Design an enzyme around this catalytic site. Structure first.
Site, mmCIF file in Angstrom:
data_model
loop_
_atom_site.group_PDB
_atom_site.id
_atom_site.type_symbol
_atom_site.label_atom_id
_atom_site.label_comp_id
_atom_site.label_asym_id
_atom_site.label_seq_id
_atom_site.Cartn_x
_atom_site.Cartn_y
_atom_site.Cartn_z
ATOM 1 N N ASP A 1 49.605 106.743 35.434
ATOM 2 C CA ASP A 1 48.683 105.699 35.835
ATOM 3 C C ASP A 1 47.334 106.331 36.157
ATOM 4 O O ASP A 1 47.187 107.557 36.175
ATOM 5 C CB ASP A 1 49.242 104.929 37.043
ATOM 6 C CG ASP A 1 48.652 103.539 37.177
ATOM 7 O OD1 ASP A 1 47.599 103.272 36.552
ATOM 8 O OD2 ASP A 1 49.235 102.717 37.924
ATOM 9 N N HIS B 1 50.476 95.237 28.249
ATOM 10 C CA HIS B 1 49.800 95.140 29.533
ATOM 11 C C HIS B 1 48.342 95.572 29.438
ATOM 12 O O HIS B 1 47.437 94.809 29.790
ATOM 13 C CB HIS B 1 50.540 95.989 30.562
ATOM 14 C CG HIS B 1 49.891 95.981 31.906
ATOM 15 N ND1 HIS B 1 49.443 94.820 32.502
ATOM 16 C CD2 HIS B 1 49.600 96.985 32.765
ATOM 17 C CE1 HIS B 1 48.917 95.107 33.681
ATOM 18 N NE2 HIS B 1 48.998 96.412 33.860
HETATM 19 C C1 HEM Z 1 53.077 97.208 40.055
HETATM 20 C C2 HEM Z 1 52.108 96.660 39.314
HETATM 21 C C3 HEM Z 1 51.424 97.385 38.129
HETATM 22 C C4 HEM Z 1 51.843 98.449 37.416
HETATM 23 C C5 HEM Z 1 53.180 99.238 37.525
HETATM 24 C C6 HEM Z 1 50.818 98.747 36.442
HETATM 25 C C7 HEM Z 1 50.880 99.764 35.520
HETATM 26 C C8 HEM Z 1 49.836 100.159 34.712
HETATM 27 C C9 HEM Z 1 49.831 101.310 33.834
HETATM 28 C C10 HEM Z 1 51.009 102.292 33.696
HETATM 29 C C11 HEM Z 1 48.648 101.343 33.195
HETATM 30 C C12 HEM Z 1 48.157 102.389 32.159
HETATM 31 C C13 HEM Z 1 47.428 103.532 32.865
HETATM 32 C C14 HEM Z 1 45.923 103.384 32.755
HETATM 33 O O1 HEM Z 1 45.435 102.922 31.697
HETATM 34 O O2 HEM Z 1 45.201 103.757 33.721
HETATM 35 C C15 HEM Z 1 47.870 100.208 33.655
HETATM 36 C C16 HEM Z 1 46.588 99.889 33.265
HETATM 37 C C17 HEM Z 1 45.839 98.830 33.735
HETATM 38 N N1 HEM Z 1 46.284 97.810 34.575
HETATM 39 FE FE1 HEM Z 1 48.107 97.723 35.496
HETATM 40 N N2 HEM Z 1 49.775 97.845 36.600
HETATM 41 C C18 HEM Z 1 50.121 96.998 37.637
HETATM 42 C C19 HEM Z 1 49.360 95.955 38.127
HETATM 43 C C20 HEM Z 1 48.152 95.518 37.610
HETATM 44 C C21 HEM Z 1 47.426 94.318 37.990
HETATM 45 C C22 HEM Z 1 47.923 93.328 39.072
HETATM 46 C C23 HEM Z 1 46.288 94.276 37.268
HETATM 47 C C24 HEM Z 1 45.158 93.213 37.255
HETATM 48 C C25 HEM Z 1 45.346 91.938 37.637
HETATM 49 C C26 HEM Z 1 46.278 95.437 36.398
HETATM 50 C C27 HEM Z 1 45.276 95.782 35.516
HETATM 51 C C28 HEM Z 1 45.224 96.942 34.774
HETATM 52 C C29 HEM Z 1 44.076 97.467 34.052
HETATM 53 C C30 HEM Z 1 42.670 96.848 33.983
HETATM 54 C C31 HEM Z 1 44.441 98.590 33.431
HETATM 55 C C32 HEM Z 1 43.539 99.468 32.541
HETATM 56 C C33 HEM Z 1 43.623 98.945 31.103
HETATM 57 C C34 HEM Z 1 42.681 99.689 30.181
HETATM 58 O O3 HEM Z 1 41.530 100.004 30.594
HETATM 59 O O4 HEM Z 1 43.089 99.980 29.026
HETATM 60 N N3 HEM Z 1 47.426 96.162 36.635
HETATM 61 N N4 HEM Z 1 48.626 99.508 34.568
#
Ligand code: HEM
Length: 451
Positions: free
Chosen positions: A167, A307
């Site tokens: 992450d 996601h």
């Molecule tokens: C337990 C809850 C969550 C988990 C396990 C999770 C997990 C992850 C993982 C593994 C990544 C890829 C790592 C990265 O690109 O930095 C990611 C990216 C991202 N997540 Fe989540 N996430 C969670 C909750 C959320 C929520 C609630 C939001 C927004 C409402 C969100 C928005 C984003 C965004 C904006 C990215 C970057 C996408 C990009 O720039 O390509 N995440 N998340």
């Protein structure tokens, strides 16, 4: 250039400390609270400049501070920020997120939370020390209503969230701040910092300059449940020679958009490439476009509903359908212990664990809230794809409807996956992180000089 000695450090660079304590509080005596703030804040509120500057001038714990709309009232500060989500508070706003408040931590179920201290350090002993020090100085002037410890996962899972995925890879930056990584978003400073360039609230009050909105969510994670689901639904390649374990990790990579190593499936769709995932220079250099591939229909490298592709639709923006309005910086930390042998064997969660989620943006409605409601929870997002191509919810964070997601099977875009809820919102609150001077000059204002 921005005054980085006046900007709270967790907004832009993150505290990047192994242990992060969240101290949520209610204000009992405004006069006594402001008095403490007047001397505490200049001595302890950690700036961007301190975090990125020489280790010699860094304190044992980094401290940041943010106030809820209710906290504004308790401090007799007018909420003229023009953020409708912020003013509503997250509890009121929660139906728009798809939350069922029956799962919320009690302290969040209302408007009693006036603000939060973020305390980051290398030992829970030091974060507890800073907490104890705050308790001693405020005395009866406040009440701690919720005290949450979060910690980076141990060993080779450090930096990974509890499902096991690396992450903190992709976050926007601003012009002139260091060197952007290949594929990293470079957004106008006003998308992150209120009052700065291209702030969509052109009407923004002067005192709010260089603040940001801090969205907090306690997101509980059901890790053995998730692992059992992807094992039970393991995918197959056209060759047909994946093991169940291999097909399960493929399916997980399709839900997230990345393998557990961080390798983006858009660059490495068929197997994990841990050297790619770990390389800051390679692991974000993608935009879902490929020679010979139709952005409107091709989900063979990354499902439209993955996601990271739901929350940052790089291809839609790159086609110019909209700008950088909807980028935001995540700065959260996993919470809770590792999965125990019993939990894994039984495929059942017995201990609370998850993500202490933090996201910063100049407009709540354009960052966290849009990513959650307009995109993750929206079964017809992304738009601009083939008219018959079914989409559904974000299979990680999508809520509010039946959790049906299409496109996860690369051999059959039409196959539906009904994903059990593996992330449960325990609630939170919307806060505003002021500039450091604003903490002292506005929120700790002791006199009644007219203006
Ligand atoms: C337990 C809850 C969550 C988990 C396990 C999770 C997990 C992850 C993982 C593994 C990544 C890829 C790592 C990265 O690109 O930095 C990611 C990216 C991202 N997540 Fe989540 N996430 C969670 C909750 C959320 C929520 C609630 C939001 C927004 C409402 C969100 C928005 C984003 C965004 C904006 C990215 C970057 C996408 C990009 O720039 O390509 N995440 N998340």
């Amino acid at each position: 250039s921005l005054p980085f000695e006046n900007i709270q450090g967790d907004i832009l660079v993150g505290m990047k400390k192994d242990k992060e304590k969240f101290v949520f509080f209610h204000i009992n005596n405004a006069t006594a609270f402001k008095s403490v703030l007047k001397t505490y804040a200049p001595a302890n509120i950690t700036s961007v400049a301190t975090i990125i500057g020489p280790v010699a001038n860094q304190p044992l714990a980094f401290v940041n501070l943010a106030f809820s709309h209710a906290g504004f009232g308790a401090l007799n500060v007018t909420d003229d920020l023009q953020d409708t989500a912020f003013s509503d508070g997250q509890f009121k706003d929660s139906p728009n997120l798809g939350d069922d408040t029956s799962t919320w931590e009690e302290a969040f179920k209302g408007t009693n939370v006036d603000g939060v201290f973020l305390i980051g350090s290398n030992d829970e002993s030091i974060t507890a020390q800073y907490r104890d020090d705050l308790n001693a100085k405020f005395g009866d002037a406040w009440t701690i209503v919720y005290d949450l410890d979060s910690a980076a996962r141990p060993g080779n899972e450090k930096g990974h969230e509890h499902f096991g995925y690396l992450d903190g890879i992709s976050n926007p930056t601003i012009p002139g701040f260091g060197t952007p990584h290949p594929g990293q978003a470079v957004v106008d400073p006003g998308i992150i910092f209120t009052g700065r360039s291209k702030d969509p609230v052109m009407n923004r009050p002067s005192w709010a300059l260089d603040g940001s909105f801090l969205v907090f969510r306690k997101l509980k994670q059901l890790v053995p449940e998730f692992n059992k689901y992807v094992l039970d639904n393991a995918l197959q390649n056209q060759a047909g020679n994946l093991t169940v374990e291999e097909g399960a990790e493929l399916l997980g990579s399709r839900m997230f958009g990345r393998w557990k190593s961080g390798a983006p499936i858009d660059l490495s769709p068929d197997f994990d490439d841990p050297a790619l995932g770990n390389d800051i220079e390679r692991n974000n250099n993608f935009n879902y476009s490929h020679p010979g591939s139709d952005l409107a229909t091709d989900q063979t490298r990354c499902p439209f509903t993955a996601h990271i592709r739901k929350t940052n639709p790089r291809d839609l923006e790159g086609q110019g359908l909209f700008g950088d309005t909807f980028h935001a910086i995540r700065a959260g930390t996993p919470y809770g212990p590792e999965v125990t042998d019993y939990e894994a064997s039984s495929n059942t969660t017995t201990i609370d664990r998850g993500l202490a989620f933090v996201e910063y943006q100049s407009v709540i409605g354009n960052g966290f809230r849009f990513q959650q409601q307009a995109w993750a929870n929206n079964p017809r997002f992304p738009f601009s794809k083939g008219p018959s191509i079914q989409l559904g919810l974000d299979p990680v964070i999508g809520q509010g409807s039946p959790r049906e997601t299409f496109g996860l099977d690369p051999r059959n875009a039409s196959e539906s996956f009904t994903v059990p809820q593996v992330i449960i919102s325990n609630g939170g609150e919307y806060f505003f992180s002021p500039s450091i001077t604003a903490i002292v000059e506005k929120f700790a204002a002791l006199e009644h000089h007219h203006h």
